[PDB]
Amino acid sequence: RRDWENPGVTQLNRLAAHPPFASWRNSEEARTDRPSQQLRSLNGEWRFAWFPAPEAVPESWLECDLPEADTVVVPSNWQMHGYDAPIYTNVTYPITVNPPFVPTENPTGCYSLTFNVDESWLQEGQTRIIFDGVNSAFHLWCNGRWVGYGQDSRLPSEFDLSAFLRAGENRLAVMVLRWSDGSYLEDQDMWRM
Amino acid sequence: DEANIETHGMVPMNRLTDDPRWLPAMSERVTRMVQRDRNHPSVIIWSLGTESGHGANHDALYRWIKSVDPSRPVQYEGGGADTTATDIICPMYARVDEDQPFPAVPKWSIKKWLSLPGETRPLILCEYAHAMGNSLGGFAKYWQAFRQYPRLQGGFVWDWVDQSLIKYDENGNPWSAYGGDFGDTPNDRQFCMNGLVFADRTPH
Amino acid sequence: RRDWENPGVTQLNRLAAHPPFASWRNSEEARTDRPSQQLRSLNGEWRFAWFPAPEAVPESWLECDLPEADTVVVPSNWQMHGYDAPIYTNVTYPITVNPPFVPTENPTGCYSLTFNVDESWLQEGQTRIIFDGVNSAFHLWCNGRWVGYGQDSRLPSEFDLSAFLRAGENRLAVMVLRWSDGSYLEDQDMWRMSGIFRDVSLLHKPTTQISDFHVATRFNDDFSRAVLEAEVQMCGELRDYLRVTVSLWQGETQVASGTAPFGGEIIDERGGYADRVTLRLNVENPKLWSAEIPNLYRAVVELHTADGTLIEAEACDVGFREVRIENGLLLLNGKPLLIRGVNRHEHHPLHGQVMDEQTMVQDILLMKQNNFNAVRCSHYPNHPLWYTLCDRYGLYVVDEANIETHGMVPMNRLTDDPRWLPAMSERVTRMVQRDRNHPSVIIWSLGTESGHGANHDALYRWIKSVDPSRPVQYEGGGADTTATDIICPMYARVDEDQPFPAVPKWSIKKWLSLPGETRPLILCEYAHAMGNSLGGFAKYWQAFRQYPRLQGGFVWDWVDQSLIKYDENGNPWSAYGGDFGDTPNDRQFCMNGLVFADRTPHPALTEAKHQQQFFQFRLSGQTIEVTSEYLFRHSDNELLHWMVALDGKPLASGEVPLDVAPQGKQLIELPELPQPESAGQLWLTVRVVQPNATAWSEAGHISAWQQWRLAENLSVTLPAASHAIPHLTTSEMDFCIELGNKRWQFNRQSGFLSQMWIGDKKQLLTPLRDQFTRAPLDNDIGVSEATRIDPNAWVERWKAAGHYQAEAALLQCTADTLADAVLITTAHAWQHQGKTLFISRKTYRIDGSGQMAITVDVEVASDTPHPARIGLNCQLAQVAERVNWLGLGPQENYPDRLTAACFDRWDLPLSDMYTPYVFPSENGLRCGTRELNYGPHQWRGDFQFNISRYSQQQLMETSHRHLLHAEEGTWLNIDGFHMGIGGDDSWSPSVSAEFQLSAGRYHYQLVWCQK
Ligand SMILES: O=C1O[C@H](CO)[C@H](O)[C@H](O)[C@H]1O
Ligand SMILES: O=C1O[C@H](CO)[C@H](O)[C@H](O)[C@H]1O
Ligand SMILES: [Mg+2]
Ligand SMILES: [Mg+2]
Ligand SMILES: [Mg+2]
Ligand SMILES: [Mg+2]
Ligand code: NA
Ligand code: NA
Ligand code: NA
Ligand code: NA
Ligand code: NA
Ligand code: NA
């Protein structure tokens, strides 16, 4: 399935959209808008590898960090890290106009992260992952198992990781595609990253 | 608040937005936006996106919003700035006194646009006074009209900050780069710099 | 991927929807609409194998026929071949409600077809396959390779097989799933079946082709001039030499034509559509289309080169008509319509939901023959041929999207969820893209019973934007939401409000004038014709005619959804909910039609025909005023026949040609009617007859009728004096009376006439007793179940009050000898647990002439539920071939459903005095009867009666008509009064107050004698 070349598939297993949540367990913290122990940020150093196309991504990556990958800061546009060139085009699409298809040479960004989750999250409640922005489409894996897929580079994509998380170390695998059928709806006059 | 939808490069511009096949993809960019930001008081108007012509998908989504959230007007400039999918006449670069009668999507003088037969909507340019390089000549002409005409309620200058990027030379000294400076081609060169301030926020 | 449990995946590799194509390579064949060599049918014998789930299907099936498979005909529903059971459920979903998931045990139908494909089809062009209907989802394979997937059981799914085919033998494998996420949007109240129930075919199109085309017709103020606008789209390589020619034909005469190269007008800053072209043809004095005169033109769309070389041609029938709502009225060609509509499901007693041309033609003819001019596709796009037939025969059509989520809680849980907007949009948009060129379709419907959600508002606007030529309606959420141009309630009553919270059903007359309301009102459903129903139908039509903005409605519904099953002896019988083991099920609720599944009319059909007549009549003196309700046609195929009779005895008759303009009037002066030579009531009956046969009716067809009482001469002459005097004999247990060869016996213990003798042959099998109950009609029952009682239903109120258990208690029984007669006086009280329900006081006067005059006076406790009837009954020993009566007929008629019946002398075989409702109940009643004759018996008076070989007891104890058995003798029920049957709906008391027996005291008299 080349879900990234089908406008009929804009996501897979993605949760419903909603207003900003923090899941406070103290009304006074909610009122004052202070931090919430139930909302953790995964921003920081991640592992990253660049590929010319998704077909070039090694399957071992799903359950094992790629030795040749680099440690980079997230969030970020990989063009700003020098992996490939940012493209500045106004009206004309950066790829051949042939919907819903995109170029076979599709820059793929493979992000990964090893993290731990406090025990209590594993015994009760629902734990979801929130990607406020991924350009322009991606597939998600947690501990080697496929979780979901999502499009639209400017809105959050959320997925329930409750059934995927384990005690100790967990690993996220995010394969980001530069181009997708979603690109046909994102032809803004700005740098294409 | 504007939906992440722009199909400017299509020919015609509404080839996708008038196609029911793309209604699903388009609807999610609109509906998920409203679901996320509808509680923000700062958001006072919803936008269906930009430069995607005027397609039947815009009308459907326009009505969806009007139904889901009647507290905010909905605007969209595609297809002539005054279609059935916008509550506000929101032209891009329409001039103060001079008409630009392009076929199908003319940009009437804003003073004239307001009184076209049957027209009663407020007019707020979603884009005007292209601030590219040494620009903003004639800016005062817009504000004199905004103040004299009740229904001419302003607009949004294009735009805030230059989209120039930092590159370094041999001596590791930084310089502002634009289209094509990364080997990117085809590219549109300096057309990515239309701000009132430099990328570092230094005022023009 | 479990695509069948993902509302985000409604298809894979499916081609865009479009109007009917045939890819003619000859313009003349396109014009005449003859067959096309480029459109083959793959209908016929296929290979089929049934599996309990998709995971049980062997991979070998993808490239090799399964030996265990059977050869079956396609199209078809596999439940009809017996592979599994069809399920009948109304509102509750046939599967657990857990969107978007379905049962793991999901019946899977594996179809396959080995067929040939000629090399010419593969050497060039595009070969695609078209599945007109697959219920409810399927994956497709061609020569072992996966092609695509499709959902929405009521619209065609097309795929390009150009790259999968080979010259010679090919094999298609189709895995059909019974359940899918699509099922959540298909909760219509009908049998739940599955399979490839619609046509399958192969269509060859050129590389450069016509990919779509829209036809529009706009007019000037008086419709004296029209402009036909045709937008045509193409696929393939764009070239300057390409051209499109749209020609309009009226028979073999080309009336107009237009040619132009591709390239539309500039649309936006990026230009226009280079792959599109709009042709505009001027048409002077166009012949207008309507259900009255279905005038049609032929539009031929030719894709060709600059100098005339044809690439391909498509075409359609064009009906010049304008549909618009103005000032609160729905107008057709500038005239306010009056919809005589009916809801019609696609149902066949043997084939299930497979539709064939014969059946469709038979339905249309019956509909038009019974004065219907409109039909609603309840509740999904129909078989494509349906629209073509409606275009040609002339019926107004409401095309409806296949969307119904009745079983959800609340009803709009999915339709208000943006996550289901994609699935919903495809059912609406693909429908419009398919049927937008059919003139018969005058209104689009967004579906039914799915509440009102934001998705409806979005799609409503989409249609309004894409096709401004037709109004859009939708009843969900209150029938008057922002998603409907027409107030279209279901079962809203005429004068009575039903103020339900949130979604009240206002009296239709009240609904129109609610503050701020200005829209027209047309019920999308009314007069629920379930079983013995349609009582009160005349009230709706009187309102429709008096109020301009009340423009009709669609009766629910056309045909009973019963299915044929065979007994141990191989004889067929009609089955309903649960008869296939299906459970849960909603029993007989699937049978609400005006006609039986085999299309035999129910008695109600005639009441509808009469009320939907297109000619109205008024009588003044000897002048009959005929008014035409036709909006466009003159009465050029009608003659008025009149007849005057004295109590059934023809006095005079004649004929007069009708020449009335649409909405015009005609005065007909009847000649001098000579006074009768005897006493009695003179009756005038008029009938509109169509001399000539038509495309929908045969010569001599009766389209309308009406009756009037003329002069009446009350009899004042007393009977010839008798010399004989009946002799009264008394015993401890009986009061016997004898006169000549006749004898009467009254049981002194029961107080009823226990026997009568002609000569010395017994006349009764059961004593003549009072009866205050009736075998419950479906309307009496409502949704009351034995395990789920609804206390409000009439049957429940009667049961709770003990009307069915009441025992007659003798209060009096005397006998007096008069000058020339014997007088028996009786009095009974029916009590239930100390409560006196009824009191019956009678007198039987037997004179020397042998006549027994029975006088009855009944008292009804004001606080007991109003009784179903007030009469007498007995089982006669006689079993005669015919029934002759002077009263309303010839068909079954009840107090609130007798406008269609006429007063006259009727004679029918006993069998016709019984209406075979699949679910047995009180039936066959005839009202306003002054004389009844059966065998040597004659009853005179002013009563209601029904007569058959079935007792009320058997009828109420029997669930299916094929289980009834003729009892000994003939059961006779003679009522002085009978309650209405109702029908405004069949799930709440619907009998209007004026037809309820609430007078408290009743009186009636009957004379029983021998002829
Ligand atoms: O119409 C427009 O004009 C600007 C030109 O700089 C810029 O491209 C905006 O994104 C676009 O909406
Ligand atoms: O409201 C309705 O009433 C009918 C009852 O027989 C039938 O279920 C229709 O499909 C439904 O729309
Ligand atoms: Mg996609
Ligand atoms: Mg642009
Ligand atoms: Mg699905
Ligand atoms: Mg229903
Ligand atoms: Na102003
Ligand atoms: Na720019
Ligand atoms: Na009316
Ligand atoms: Na029903
Ligand atoms: Na005539
Ligand atoms: Na019964």
Please tell me the number of Cα atoms within 13 Å of C705 on its side-chain side. Answer: 21
- CB spacing of A9 vs C11 below 8 angstroms: no
How many beta carbons lie within 10 A of that of residue C517, not counting itself?
A: 14
Q: What is the largest CA-CA distance in chain A?
A: 54
What are residue C757's DSSP bridge partners? Answer: C743, C762
DSSP C768: B
Cis peptide before C70 (omega within 30 of 0): no
B130 is in an annotated binding site: yes
Q: Which residues of B are catalytic?
A: 51, 127
C262 is in an annotated binding site: no
DSSP C569: T
Nearest CA to ligand 1 atom 8: A189
Ligand 10 centre from C594 Cα, in Å? 12
DSSP string, C94-145: SS--BTTB--SS--EEEEEEEEEE-HHHHSSSEEEEEES--BSEEEEEETTE
Q: Does any ligand 1 atom lie closer than 6 A to the CB of residue B181?
A: no
Burial label, C807 (beta-carbon count in 10 A; 0-12, 13-18, 19+): exposed
Using alpha carbons, select from A180, A136, A176 the residue that is nearest to residue A7.
Answer: A180
Q: What gap in Å lies between CA C204 and CA C22, rounded to an integer? A: 8
Using alpha carbons, select from C584, C531, C487 the residue that is nearest to residue C924.
Answer: C531
Q: Does any ligand 1 atom lie closer than 6 A to the CB of residue B92?
A: yes
Ligand 5 centre from C100 Cα, in Å? 8
C406 is in an annotated binding site: yes
- The answer to whether C482 faces chain B, any CB pair under 8 Å, is yes
CB C966 within 8 A of CB C913: no
- The answer to whether C6 faces chain B, any CB pair under 8 Å, is no
- CB spacing of B31 vs A19 below 8 angstroms: no
Buried b (16+ CB within 10 A) or exposed e, C348-370: bbebbbbbeeebbeebbbbbbbb
How many beta carbons lie within 10 A of that of residue B115, not counting itself?
A: 12
DSSP string, C283-320: EESPPBB-SSSB--EEEEEEEEETTS-EEEEEEEEE-B
Using alpha carbons, select from A78, A114, A28 the residue that is nearest to residue A192.
Answer: A78
Quick one: which H or E segment has residue C439? Answer: none
Q: How far is CA C229 from CA B192, C248, C805, in A?
A: 44, 11, 71
Ligand 3 centre from A4 Cα, in Å? 4
How was this one solved?
Answer: X-ray
Q: What gap in Å lies between CA C697 and CA C693, rounded to an integer? A: 5
Cis peptide before B186 (omega within 30 of 0): yes
DSSP C337: -
How many beta carbons lie within 10 A of that of residue C166, not counting itself?
A: 11
The pairing of strands C137-142 and C734-739 is unpaired
CB C627 within 8 A of CB C616: yes
CB C32 within 8 A of CB C214: no
- Token pair belonging to B169: 């030379």
CB A143 within 8 A of CB A173: no
Contacts of C923 (CB under 8 A, 6+ apart): C532, C892, C914, C915, C917, C946, C948, C955
Q: What gap in Å lies between CA C595 and CA B182, rounded to an integer? A: 77
Q: What gap in Å lies between CA C491 and CA C985, rounded to an integer? A: 6
Sheet harboring C39-41: ordered strands across?
C39-41, C200-205, C126-131, C157-160
Distance, C-alpha C278 to centroid of its chain: 41
How many beta carbons lie within 10 A of that of residue C511, not counting itself?
A: 21
Q: What gap in Å lies between CA C105 and CA A131, rounded to an integer? A: 36
Long-range own/partner contacts, residues C944-947 (CB < 8 A, 24 or more apart): C944/C869, C944/C871, C944/C895, C944/C974, C944/C975, C944/C976, C944/C977, C944/C978, C945/C885, C945/C972, C945/C973, C945/C974, C945/C975, C946/C913, C946/C922, C946/C973, C947/C883, C947/C910, C947/C913, C947/C971, C947/C972, C947/C973
DSSP C623: E
- CB spacing of C457 vs B59 below 8 angstroms: no
- The structure was resolved to a resolution in Å of 2.0
Cis peptide before B203 (omega within 30 of 0): no
User: Which of the listed residues A93, A189, A190, A191 should we mutate to test ligand 1's pocket, taking the one with most ligand atoms within 8 A of CB?
Assistant: A189
Nearest CA to ligand 1 atom 7: A189
DSSP A109: E
Q: Does any ligand 2 atom lie closer than 6 A to the CB of residue C343?
A: no
Alpha-helical runs (H) found in chain A:
27-32, 120-123
Q: How far is CA B35 from CA A184, B59, C291, C431, C916, in A?
A: 23, 19, 47, 29, 57
The alpha carbon of residue C152 is apart from the nearest alpha carbon of chain A, in Å, by 15
Domains parsed from chain B with CATH numbers: 1-204 (3.20.20.80)
Q: What gap in Å lies between CA C697 and CA C699, rounded to an integer? A: 7
Buried b (16+ CB within 10 A) or exposed e, C439-471: bbbbbbbbbbbbbbbbbbbbbbbbbbbbbebbb
User: Which of A10, A19, A85 is opposite residue B183, by nearest beta carbon?
Assistant: A85
Contacts of C621 (CB under 8 A, 6+ apart): none
The pairing of strands C521-526 and C550-555 is parallel
Nearest CA in chain C to B13: C270
Q: Which of residues 157-186 of A touch B (CB under 8 A)?
A: 181-182, 184-186
Contacts of C786 (CB under 8 A, 6+ apart): none
DSSP C257: E
DSSP string, C152-178: -TTS-EEEE-TTT--SEEEEEEEEEES
- CB spacing of B187 vs A89 below 8 angstroms: yes
Q: How far is CA B99 from CA B76, B114, B154, in A?
A: 21, 13, 18
Q: How far is CA C877 from CA C851, C882, C939, C967, in A?
A: 19, 15, 16, 10
Quick one: which H or E segment has residue C476? Answer: none
The alpha carbon of residue C468 is apart from the nearest alpha carbon of chain B, in Å, by 12
Contacts of C971 (CB under 8 A, 6+ apart): C766, C873, C874, C875, C876, C947, C948, C949, C950, C951, C952
- CA dihedral B17→B23→B25→B28, nearest 10 degrees, is 110
Instruction: Compute and round to an integer the Cα radius of gyration of chain B.
Output: 19
**What backbone torsions phi and psi does residue C404 show, to the nearest 5 degrees?**
-150, 120
Q: Which residues of C are catalytic?
A: 449, 525
Hey, CA dihedral for B81, B82, B83, B87, is it positive or negative?
Answer: positive
Using alpha carbons, select from C229, C225, C368 the residue that is nearest to residue C287.
Answer: C225
Alpha-helical runs (H) found in C264-420:
357-369, 384-393
User: Which of the listed residues B50, B158, B196 should we mutate to test ligand 1's pocket, taking the one with most ligand atoms within 8 A of CB?
Assistant: B158
Find the length of chain B: 204
Q: What gap in Å lies between CA C130 and CA C152, rounded to an integer? A: 14
- The answer to whether A7 faces chain B, any CB pair under 8 Å, is yes
Nearest CA in chain C to A92: C270
Cis peptide before C65 (omega within 30 of 0): no
- The answer to whether B198 faces chain C, any CB pair under 8 Å, is no
How many beta carbons lie within 10 A of that of residue B97, not counting itself?
A: 10
Using alpha carbons, select from C185, C563, C554 the residue that is nearest to residue C353.
Answer: C563
CB C532 within 8 A of CB C917: yes
- The answer to whether C238 faces chain B, any CB pair under 8 Å, is no
- Token pair belonging to B52: 């995607």
Which residues are close to ligand 7, an ion, with C-beta < 5 A? B 146, 149, 152-153
Tell me which amino acid residue C763 is: Q
Contacts of C789 (CB under 8 A, 6+ apart): C796
- The answer to whether C2 faces chain A, any CB pair under 8 Å, is no
- CB spacing of B104 vs C429 below 8 angstroms: no
Contacts of C64 (CB under 8 A, 6+ apart): none
- Token pair belonging to C611: 């009320």
CA angle C231, C236, C240 (to 5 degrees): 75
CB A137 within 8 A of CB A177: yes
Sheet harboring C615-620: ordered strands across?
C615-620, C623-628, C665-669
- Token pair belonging to C716: 């004042």
User: Which of the listed residues C402, C491, C525, C561 should we mutate to test ligand 2's pocket, taking the one with most ligand atoms within 8 A of CB?
Assistant: C525
CB C973 within 8 A of CB C771: yes
Q: Does any ligand 2 atom lie closer than 6 A to the CB of residue C558?
A: no
C532 is in an annotated binding site: no
Q: What gap in Å lies between CA C85 and CA C82, rounded to an integer? A: 7
Q: What gap in Å lies between CA C423 and CA C410, rounded to an integer? A: 19
Q: What gap in Å lies between CA C790 and CA C989, rounded to an integer? A: 11
The pairing of strands C157-160 and C126-131 is antiparallel
Q: How far is CA C681 from CA C650, C710, C958, in A?
A: 12, 7, 41
Please tell me the number of Cα atoms within 13 Å of A24 on its side-chain side. Answer: 12
Tell me which amino acid residue C127 is: T
Number of B to C CB contacts under 8 A, please give it.
95
CB B158 within 8 A of CB B194: yes
Nearest CA to ligand 2 atom 10: C189
- CB spacing of C419 vs A16 below 8 angstroms: yes
Q: Does any ligand 1 atom lie closer than 6 A to the CB of residue A124?
A: no
C449 is in an annotated binding site: yes
- Token pair belonging to A16: 């419903």
CB C282 within 8 A of CB C294: no
DSSP B188: -
CB C881 within 8 A of CB C922: no
Hey, CA dihedral for B10, B11, B16, B21, is it positive or negative?
Answer: negative
Q: How far is CA C158 from CA B137, C11, C40, C68, C755, in A?
A: 57, 10, 14, 29, 74
